[PDB]
Write a structure and sequence with these properties.
Blueprint (H helix, E strand, L loop, with lengths): L25 E2 L3 E4 L3 E4 L6 E2 L8 H14 L12 H20 L5 H11 L21 E4 L46 E3 L4 H14 L2 H6 L8 E4 L8 H14 L5 H5 L4 E2 L6 H7 L6 E2 L1 H12 L10 H4 L7 E2 L8 E3 L9 H11 L11 H16 L10 H10 L4 E5 H4 L14 H14 L4 E8 L2 E8 L13 H4 L3 E6 L12 E4 L8 E8 L4 E3 L11 E2 L5 E4 L7 E2 L4 E9 L27 H4 L3 E3 L15 H7 L1 H7 L3 E3 L13 H4 L23 H13 L3 E6 L3 E2 L4 E10 L12 E10 L5 H5 L4 H7 L29 E5 L10 E2 L4 E2 L11 H4 L2
Parallel strand pairs: 7-8, 7-25, 9-11, 11-12, 12-23, 23-24, 24-25
Antiparallel strand pairs: 1-4, 2-3, 5-27, 5-29, 6-26, 6-29, 10-13, 13-14, 14-15, 15-22, 16-20, 17-18, 17-19, 17-22, 21-22, 27-28, 30-31
Helix pairs in contact: 1-2, 4-6, 11-12, 13-15, 18-21
This protein binds a molecule of 3 linked components (GLC-GLC-AC1) and calcium ion (CA).
Family: Belongs to the glycosyl hydrolase 70 family.
Function: Production of extracellular glucans, that are thought to play a key role in the development of the dental plaque because of their ability to adhere to smooth surfaces and mediate the aggregation of bacterial cells and food debris.
Catalytic activity: [(1->6)-alpha-D-glucosyl](n) + sucrose = [(1->6)-alpha-D-glucosyl](n+1) + D-fructose
Length: 842
Amino acid sequence: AQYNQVYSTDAANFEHVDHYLTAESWYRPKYILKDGKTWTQSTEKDFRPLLMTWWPDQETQRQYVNYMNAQLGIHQTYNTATSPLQLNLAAQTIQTKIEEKITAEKNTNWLRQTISAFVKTQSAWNSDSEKPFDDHLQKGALLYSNNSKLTSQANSNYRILNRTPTNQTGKKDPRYTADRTIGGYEFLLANDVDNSNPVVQAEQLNWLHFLMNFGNIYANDPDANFDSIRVDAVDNVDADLLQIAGDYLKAAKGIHKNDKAANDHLSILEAWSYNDTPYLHDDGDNMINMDNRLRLSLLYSLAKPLNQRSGMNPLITNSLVNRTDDNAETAAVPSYSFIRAHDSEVQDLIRDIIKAEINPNVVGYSFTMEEIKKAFEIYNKDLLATEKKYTHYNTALSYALLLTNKSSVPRVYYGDMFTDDGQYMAHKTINYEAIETLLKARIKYVSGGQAMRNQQVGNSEIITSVRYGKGALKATDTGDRITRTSGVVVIEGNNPSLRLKASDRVVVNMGAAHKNQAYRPLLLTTDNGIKAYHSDQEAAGLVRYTNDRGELIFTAADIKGYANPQVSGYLGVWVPVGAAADQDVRVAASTAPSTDGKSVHQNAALDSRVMFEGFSNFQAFATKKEEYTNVVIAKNVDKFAEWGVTDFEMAPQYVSSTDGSFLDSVIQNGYAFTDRYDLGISKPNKYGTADDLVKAIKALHSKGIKVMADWVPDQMYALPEKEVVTATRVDKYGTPVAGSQIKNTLYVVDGKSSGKDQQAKYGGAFLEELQAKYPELFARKQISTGVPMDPSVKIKQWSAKYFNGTNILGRGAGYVLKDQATNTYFSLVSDNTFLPKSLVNP
Ligand SMILES: C[C@H]1O[C@H](O[C@H]2[C@H](O)[C@@H](O)[C@@H](O[C@H]3[C@H](O)[C@@H](O)[C@@H](O)O[C@@H]3CO)O[C@@H]2CO)[C@H](O)[C@@H](O)[C@@H]1N[C@H]1C=C(CO)[C@@H](O)[C@H](O)[C@H]1O
Ligand SMILES: [Ca+2]
């Protein structure tokens, strides 16, 4: 009894969290039974575990001896039958052995840990009370109560959930109907930042500005800023952030004034809902979104297994732009196109491989480093197979359309040019040649109106895609010298068993500027792969002519199906003969004032851009300075120039967390981070040091290339400090989970930043300069909240009050200790102290 009770009931006497007690709390007893022999006065050194002497119920005080009788080598145990009395000596017997084992161990860490192991063995302290799980990527979420007396420092007047672009107002937008859902959901991974909180919005703005001024702020070098941003996980945050970020580009960079200004800071969303493009358009085209339909069309018409491949027509018409005849000087809506990304169609395929040939139950993308490399042997091998079982077919065919299509900024994926695993740019993919050739031809030849045709021939079908040449929007436009020596034609089949009859002819119209002209191949499919023609010269043997009307004509002699590691179907591309070594048909954005109330315009100048996604989730880690990506990037700034890369999308530069709780923090891509401002500052990030970063931004700028910052306002990982919140189990939309036990109940989260990281340094730091120069950003009443941002407080330290909630942590429904008689939390706040009866009054 007595000695065991609490030395005194001050906060100082307990390891508590927000003045609550957890099943893992140690405390300071009055005396310690020194070496279970005699009873000293507790000095401030003398902290013992609570469970050593108190138990939530008797039933738990039971497993506790049993389990602890194991450890210390006592060789008794009791079943459910036993009297209280015995359980109570068993435990004192257990305590002596704990001192005698603390003296002889000269510490008490060995116990820190037999305790923990045991807490873990118990339901209410363990995932079991967290079920049932749901389809959240990490199995479940906890939503934090807005109003709890128990945890008032964690209250909030916001935590408005699910305000995606479609649902920004708390009701599905009537305007946009292609996606009939509400267009996203709130909880994605880790600690969900509540971007419906006006103070937080302000802070995202702070952060945005900082990124965009990185050079000035961090290196004092105006030449090292990020030019643009990518908004990550749009469909999982409050869309207010879109007017916020849009407002900022307009106020600080003037993108709304003319295209030249707009294109120098060209920014994108990652927004998957079909509703997000029209949404963004009506919002003023202040950044551009992906073309989701065209991506899907390429995926299914070209990349999928031969038996799951669809017809080719969708390559022409399932897109934001119908490319049957695209003759518009400016497209109705701007966008970027891609076939693969760092996540889309990469990490999927790896998960496919694990699930299929390594771990059957693997969850979401919570892979191990193990599984991954195991997976990559299968994958790299399939990459070279003609019959692919996991990886894409026809990569070159997809890039041929992406790089010649009109009315979209094509984004090339690093991993389609270099190996998805492996040191930065160390190994070229089998497609690097064709892609590079296209990239280079694009600069020289791709310009003008477009026509695409789908023709049924032989036993299958082909499509033709043609670009008329610089400054001919129409088939009848005749243009000038340069028109004559520009344009291109791509011909594609998606069926290895394509056969033309002898009489069959694919008659392509190349445009008025092209009568009676010699053309030569650029790429041709061959039995083993695809053959690239780097100049007129190199292709002298294979010239062919257009006729009187500017038509190229093709025959069984040219077109037939193939099956090799590169092509499953048919690819042919032709270009006019006689273009100057240095011919360049791209075109510069004009400074003429914009008058349509949009910022970005999909015109010839925007089509002149190419975006490069310059990383891979699955890159090797650098073994040495020379291998750091940002080091390598600076050194190869010329290749990108040579490819026509105008916008370099860098990976997120935040220093990665390493808890391993998701793929992101296993391979450290930079989407999982604890410090928003720590861009390789406190230690190198996967890609190099903050200085290596600066130099790579500088290198790219030296070529005039723009550099994009991945803005990640959705979540944060691995917060160092604990906090107690009032929590509820919820699925990804924030709906309470049926039959869960965690319902408005205290939970200990990892919800606090260190108060002394970069965040502490820069949080809210420029709010003041921002309100001074751009007062209108702070005038706007944000849509979901009805009110402006609130810069009146700075976020110096993240804490649960700025979050919506968190992924379950496996701590349990009863981790915060409760008197079961009264059903009350124990509390150590000094006016209101409430302690386990035995410990205070024995
Ligand atoms: C990875 C990505 O996930 C989140 O987006 C999800 C979409 O909301 C879901 O729709 C589904 O997207 C699918 C499309 O609806 C469907 O058309 C089909 O094409 O497949 C699409 C993807 O398979 O799945 C997506 C994820 O389940 C989220 O909005 C986005 O942030 C996520 N990407 C970023 C997230 C992080 C961390 O923030 C990193 O892992 C990624 O690399 C980021 O790019
Ligand atoms: Ca969110």
